[PDB]
Scaffold this active site. Structure first.
Site, PDB file in Angstrom:
ATOM      1  CD1 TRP A  29      35.028  -3.127 -49.094  1.00 14.28           C
ATOM      2  CD2 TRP A  29      33.208  -4.280 -48.351  1.00 14.28           C
ATOM      3  NE1 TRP A  29      35.506  -4.046 -48.081  1.00 14.28           N
ATOM      4  CE2 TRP A  29      34.275  -4.392 -47.618  1.00 14.28           C
ATOM      5  CE3 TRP A  29      31.859  -4.582 -48.131  1.00 14.28           C
ATOM      6  CZ2 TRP A  29      34.030  -5.598 -46.564  1.00 14.28           C
ATOM      7  CZ3 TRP A  29      31.710  -5.690 -47.005  1.00 14.28           C
ATOM      8  CH2 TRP A  29      32.740  -5.981 -46.368  1.00 14.28           C
ATOM      9  CD  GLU A  62      38.223  -6.554 -53.900  1.00 12.75           C
ATOM     10  OE1 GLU A  62      37.905  -7.443 -52.989  1.00 12.75           O
ATOM     11  OE2 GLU A  62      37.357  -5.638 -53.961  1.00 12.75           O
ATOM     12  CG  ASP A  98      32.120  -6.785 -54.910  1.00 12.58           C
ATOM     13  OD1 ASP A  98      32.962  -6.136 -54.881  1.00 12.58           O
ATOM     14  OD2 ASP A  98      31.727  -7.414 -53.843  1.00 12.58           O
ATOM     15  CD  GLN A 106      36.122  -9.604 -46.207  1.00 11.29           C
ATOM     16  OE1 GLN A 106      34.755  -9.015 -46.654  1.00 11.29           O
ATOM     17  NE2 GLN A 106      37.016  -9.643 -46.968  1.00 11.29           N
ATOM     18  CG  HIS A 161      30.941 -10.867 -56.268  1.00  2.70           C
ATOM     19  ND1 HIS A 161      32.381 -11.565 -56.394  1.00  2.70           N
ATOM     20  CD2 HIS A 161      30.939 -10.136 -55.125  1.00  2.70           C
ATOM     21  CE1 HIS A 161      32.829 -11.155 -55.258  1.00  2.70           C
ATOM     22  NE2 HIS A 161      32.186 -10.313 -54.444  1.00  2.70           N
ATOM     23  CG  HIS A 175      36.571 -11.934 -52.531  1.00  2.00           C
ATOM     24  ND1 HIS A 175      35.537 -12.817 -52.296  1.00  2.00           N
ATOM     25  CD2 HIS A 175      35.836 -10.784 -52.475  1.00  2.00           C
ATOM     26  CE1 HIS A 175      34.157 -12.151 -52.460  1.00  2.00           C
ATOM     27  NE2 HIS A 175      34.563 -10.641 -52.447  1.00  2.00           N
ATOM     28  CG  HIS A 212      29.805  -9.071 -50.382  1.00  2.00           C
ATOM     29  ND1 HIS A 212      30.755  -9.870 -49.674  1.00  2.00           N
ATOM     30  CD2 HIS A 212      30.426  -8.867 -51.492  1.00  2.00           C
ATOM     31  CE1 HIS A 212      31.800 -10.051 -50.335  1.00  2.00           C
ATOM     32  NE2 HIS A 212      31.679  -9.287 -51.502  1.00  2.00           N
TER      33      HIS A 212
HETATM   34  O1  LIG Z   1      36.873  -8.825 -49.737  1.00  6.09           O
HETATM   35  C1  LIG Z   1      35.792  -8.180 -49.986  1.00  6.09           C
HETATM   36  N1  LIG Z   1      34.860  -8.149 -49.486  1.00  6.09           N
HETATM   37  C2  LIG Z   1      33.501  -7.391 -50.018  1.00  6.09           C
HETATM   38  C3  LIG Z   1      33.686  -6.664 -50.926  1.00  6.09           C
HETATM   39  F1  LIG Z   1      32.388  -5.905 -51.419  1.00  6.09           F
HETATM   40  C4  LIG Z   1      34.639  -6.933 -51.979  1.00  6.09           C
HETATM   41  O2  LIG Z   1      34.194  -7.699 -52.771  1.00  6.09           O
HETATM   42  N2  LIG Z   1      35.887  -7.629 -51.317  1.00  6.09           N
HETATM   43 FE   LIG Z   2      32.971  -9.232 -53.174  1.00  2.00          FE
END
Ligand SMILES: O=C1NC=C(F)[C@H](O)N1
Ligand SMILES: [Fe+3]
Ligand SMILES: O=C1NC=C(F)[C@H](O)N1
Ligand SMILES: [Fe+3]
EC number: 3.5.4.1
Lengths: 423, 423
Positions: free
Chosen positions: B316, B214, B310, B153, B58, B211, B60
């Protein structure tokens, strides 16, 4: 035949201002460089504060003045209140509703309130109070623009013929569609009731004002459906979520997520401080929660929130004189909006923000608008709030419709001295 | 032209082992009864640990390396992070996404990571980052097998044309369908979004990585729908629930009930320790919750759970070098998996368990598999974790694709002494 309001202070503005009136409207507003002399046809604000009229965004005129009839709400809860009201609702008569509504409306006129939104219980096959209120609306029109919410107090899906009665109320002329999702028998009925409410508002082109999550239940989240449906239909300006006291009990993470939607949706929020502090927190022992929605955070996020009195001497509230500065005073304390600026800007919660909640199209001291305004014998919002000042003059259509000659207090020391509580 | 890996230690195995390589694959694995001599065509693990490649389940890559552009996430929350990302998303260009993704991918190659699953935000009508990432996937293929998740997102039902854009991303080649139910405007949209996600995954024969929950909201239970839909469709192996940080806040009775379904469903779980400890608990004052999902209990129940980084220097997360042993270190501490065996077996959380999460079909040191493996200069998982060792060699298709000459530390006492921090 007033032609001008002189020596007026305006919120957020420096100095004094002159407001020219022509044909029942405000023709122009000009700054003064000093104090103007009085003259015939001139109403002297005497350096007091001039603001558009106070607004009552949430009151129950069908239940007003009935506290203790036939029984008192002993527990001081919303639930017992509805039960006590049901007993009184069975005894309603046309004339009684009109008389009681008019009694409170006169107090409102005296208190500079020119816009009122009253909820009327339509969980009643006879629609007795609604028929009476529709007549009161016409009768009081020269002084107050009254909006009527068809409020299905006992639920839409949880009361016999609830949906049919709600629609009948709209066909008779109610201005706003109400709902009470947290009182429906199930969460599913609550959500479904909101879809039905929105469908009716779009069918009849009416506003929406939901008694929303008025309960200390952290799982009562009907507000997200109200906001989502408004966003989907592109009608946030026409929608209001009243109370949302459950928000006081939500965890912060969900509230943060929710706030994005609340802002995007553009819906309005009404907090009712006098009633909320009384009815909420009743199931706690100690500590006891305050129970008012997140007013401070809404203001910080630019979400429109305002204050209503909700009830005046009825099942849900044994006090009141329908005074908005008193409602504001309670709200500022309970919500801890006690910074000087927060208190001073407090007037917005009972004027401009409430006008937006009612979707008013002719409101504010601006050229072209009807000459509807009130004069407070105070220097600014802070001063008016601190001293709980009366409304010196209420002007509507360019004419005085109410006035209060202030009380005069004297203390007899070595010499008599006038006391006005100012500094 | 490597023919053998000698003097290799293997997790859970005693002694040393020889791994024979033929035509880019592992032809055989044989135990040694002693240390084998080095020779040409032999890569000497030097009694270090040999394991299949590290995996990043995981990350981004479309947002990597953008922290502070154009603004910083001041609150350190998921919600502000999405807002800051939206500002950056509007400034995306094809080349910029490729350059930043490649920068982080090179760090990953250096860190022995040969499998990466990147989420790419598809709440963007231009699909700029997705188009760039599809090219990066092809370009990096000789070194890393990159999976792309079409990640909506800003929601599927809560963003304009969200569902159409999600499907467009799959038609363009995304490998995995994403969702973010807790960010949808309502609980109902959240649940509905999952039905749509599963329908798309079955229509295109793609994997799913949600996701999921969270948020520090004890009422965020979208994970039960993810697991139930996977069980109904008999596709658990193809499904992953990322984060599930809300599970950290659930009552124990509901969690126990839920665990039966999680196990029966066969779905995978990803915890992201570095980001979770940073973004979760932000609405608490004190005490402050950790906010990582129930990793320890999942392991005890035989539920597949693994760790992702992540984010690497983005909205983030302001840190990182894309190092899986560092991610593991944080997770073991925050989840209190601090027993010797728990720490030693920790490598599974960044190797085998992650390979299962990505549904990999060619992974592990076994005859017949591609010769993809890495060598750590450590005696076992515990030692590698304690000393945060680099990857001595990364081998793919039987060829070395990365190597690290270890640092050399010396202390000058009465005589110089080499320090390796071993015992
Ligand atoms: O919704 C999200 N976007 C980006 C992230 F790094 C986190 O995992 N959650
Ligand atoms: Fe994420
Ligand atoms: O449901 C309600 N009915 C009457 C009240 F005063 C309170 O606003 N809530
Ligand atoms: Fe009310």
């Amino acid at each position: 035949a007033l032609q001008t309001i002189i020596n007026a202070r305006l919120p957020g503005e420096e100095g004094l201002w002159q407001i020219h009136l022509q044909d029942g409207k405000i023709s122009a507003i000009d700054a003064q460089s000093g104090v103007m002399p009085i003259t015939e046809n001139s109403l002297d604000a005497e350096q007091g504060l001039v603001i558009p009229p106070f607004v009552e965004p949430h009151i129950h005129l069908d239940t007003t003045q009935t506290a203790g009839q036939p029984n008192w709400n002993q527990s001081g809860t919303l639930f017992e209140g509805i039960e006590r009201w049901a007993e009184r609702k069975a005894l309603l008569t046309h004339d009684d509703v009109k008389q009681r509504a008019w009694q409170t409306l006169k107090w409102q006129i005296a208190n500079g309130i020119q816009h009122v939104r009253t909820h009327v219980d339509v969980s009643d096959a006879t629609l007795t109070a609604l028929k009476a209120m529709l007549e009161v609306k016409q009768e009081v029109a020269p002084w107050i623009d009254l909006q009527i919410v068809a409020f299905p107090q006992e639920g839409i899906l949880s009361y016999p013929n609830g949906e049919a009665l709600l629609e009948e109320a709209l066909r008779l002329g109610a201005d706003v569609v109400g709902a009470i999702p947290h009182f429906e028998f199930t969460r599913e009925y609550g959500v479904e009731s909101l879809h039905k409410t929105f469908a009716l508002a779009q069918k009849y082109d009416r506003l929406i004002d939901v008694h929303c999550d008025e309960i200390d239940d952290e799982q009562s989240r009907f507000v997200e459906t109200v906001a989502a449906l408004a966003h989907h239909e592109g009608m946030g300006a026409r929608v209001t979520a009243s109370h949302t006291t459950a928000m006081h009990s939500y965890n912060g993470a969900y509230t943060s997520r929710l706030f994005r939607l609340l802002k995007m949706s553009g819906i309005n929020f009404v907090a009712n401080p006098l009633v909320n502090i009384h009815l909420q927190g009743r199931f706690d022992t100690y500590p006891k929660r305050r129970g008012i929605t997140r007013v401070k955070e809404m203001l910080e996020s630019g979400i429109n929130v305002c204050f209503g009195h909700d009830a005046v001497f009825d099942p849900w509230y044994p006090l009141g004189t329908a005074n908005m500065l008193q409602v504001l005073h309670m709200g500022l304390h309970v919500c801890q909006l006690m910074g000087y600026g927060q208190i001073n800007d407090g007037l917005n919660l009972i004027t401009h923000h409430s006008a937006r909640t009612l979707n008013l199209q002719d409101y504010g001291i601006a050229a072209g608008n009807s000459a509807n305004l009130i004069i407070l014998p105070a220097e600014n919002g802070f001063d008016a709030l601190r001293r709980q000042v009366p409304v010196r003059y209420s002007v509507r259509g360019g004419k005085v419709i109410a006035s209060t000659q202030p009380a005069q207090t004297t203390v007899y020391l070595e010499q008599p001295e006038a006391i006005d509580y100012k500094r």
